[PDB]
Design an enzyme around this catalytic site. Structure first.
Site, mmCIF file in Angstrom:
data_model
loop_
_atom_site.group_PDB
_atom_site.id
_atom_site.type_symbol
_atom_site.label_atom_id
_atom_site.label_comp_id
_atom_site.label_asym_id
_atom_site.label_seq_id
_atom_site.Cartn_x
_atom_site.Cartn_y
_atom_site.Cartn_z
ATOM 1 C CG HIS A 40 -1.011 39.843 104.507
ATOM 2 N ND1 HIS A 40 -0.021 40.387 104.181
ATOM 3 C CD2 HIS A 40 -1.733 39.206 103.618
ATOM 4 C CE1 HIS A 40 0.282 39.872 102.866
ATOM 5 N NE2 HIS A 40 -0.652 38.984 102.597
ATOM 6 C CD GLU A 52 5.053 20.508 99.864
ATOM 7 O OE1 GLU A 52 5.061 19.889 98.642
ATOM 8 O OE2 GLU A 52 4.164 20.175 100.495
ATOM 9 C CD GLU A 62 7.086 16.305 99.421
ATOM 10 O OE1 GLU A 62 7.537 15.218 99.873
ATOM 11 O OE2 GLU A 62 6.350 16.541 98.596
ATOM 12 C CG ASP A 84 2.155 42.453 105.644
ATOM 13 O OD1 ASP A 84 1.909 41.637 106.607
ATOM 14 O OD2 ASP A 84 1.824 42.172 104.721
ATOM 15 C CG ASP A 171 2.550 42.255 90.483
ATOM 16 O OD1 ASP A 171 1.337 42.853 90.578
ATOM 17 O OD2 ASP A 171 3.330 42.082 91.372
ATOM 18 C CD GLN A 174 -5.254 38.340 94.344
ATOM 19 O OE1 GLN A 174 -6.331 37.968 93.872
ATOM 20 N NE2 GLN A 174 -4.730 39.384 94.053
ATOM 21 N N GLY A 175 -2.033 34.411 96.880
ATOM 22 C CA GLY A 175 -1.475 33.307 96.951
ATOM 23 C C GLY A 175 0.322 33.148 97.207
ATOM 24 C CB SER A 177 0.433 36.867 100.721
ATOM 25 O OG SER A 177 -0.555 37.714 99.963
ATOM 26 N N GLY A 178 3.329 36.662 101.696
ATOM 27 C CA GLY A 178 4.356 36.363 102.494
ATOM 28 C C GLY A 178 5.654 35.570 102.119
#
Length: 223
Positions: A40, A52, A62, A84, A171, A174-175, A177-178
């Site tokens: 996603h 980073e 970096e 996913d 938990d 958002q952000g 993800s992945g």
């Protein structure tokens, strides 16, 4: 990450930030040429940022590498988020060092109760919005499928597992993800989805990586 702590510069060497002019998802380095993330998170024109900590300041460790190709799982279902997972190959091999390292894939699946480390630059508020510039960390246990489904009423497949606290307060969000979910030195999960963030009886849902080792290995061997 909600209710977590500042990891500390480069203490999670396998953590990567996917950038398309701005950070939009996390990922995990599994070797010098490949990164694993969530399907996603798919987007065209991705630049992988390794080593980073503060994503808004060049600190010196970096490595910015463009993606040469992206492979979303053949059976990814965007409606249920089943399967996913996505692989990204770097245009050039990353230089591995103390700040930039790969994370091992699992051999066996992790069991309920096992502690894992979740990391990311996602939202830190359960109510409202506040994005951190430094990497955040959270230690959370794997919950049994039964405990998760009963409490949350979530529709989960065998390709997913829940992790977190039913009491809420901690938990992913958002952000994130992945991002990686590492347990006992192995990448067991990928930040996938959930309902809100850090809510009671609503733990995070993660892609069960141990079910994709064969696909991952076969794909990287042929690409």
């Amino acid at each position: 990450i909600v209710g977590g702590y500042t990891c500390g510069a480069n203490t999670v060497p396998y953590q990567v930030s996917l950038n398309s002019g701005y950070h939009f998802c996390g990922g995990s380095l599994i070797n010098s040429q490949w990164v694993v993330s969530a399907a996603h998170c798919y987007k065209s024109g991705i630049q992988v940022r390794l080593g980073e900590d503060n994503i808004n300041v060049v600190e010196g460790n970096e490595q910015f590498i463009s993606a040469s190709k992206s492979i979303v799982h053949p059976s990814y279902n965007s409606e249920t988020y089943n399967n996913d997972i996505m692989l990204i190959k770097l245009k050039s091999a990353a230089s591995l060092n103390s700040r930039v390292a790969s994370i091992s894939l699992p051999t066996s699946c992790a069991s309920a109760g096992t502690q894992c480390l979740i990391s990311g630059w996602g939202n830190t508020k359960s109510s409202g919005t506040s994005y951190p510039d430094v990497l955040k960390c959270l230690k959370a246990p794997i919950l049994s499928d039964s405990s998760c489904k009963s409490a949350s009423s979530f529709i989960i497949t065998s390709n997913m597992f829940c992790a977190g606290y039913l009491e809420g307060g901690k938990d992913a969000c958002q952000g994130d993800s992945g991002g990686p979910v590492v347990c006992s030195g192995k990448l067991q999960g990928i930040v996938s989805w959930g309902e809100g963030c850090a809510q009671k009886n609503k733990p995070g849902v993660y892609t069960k990586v141990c079910n994709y080792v064969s696909w991952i290995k076969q794909t990287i061997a042929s690409n």
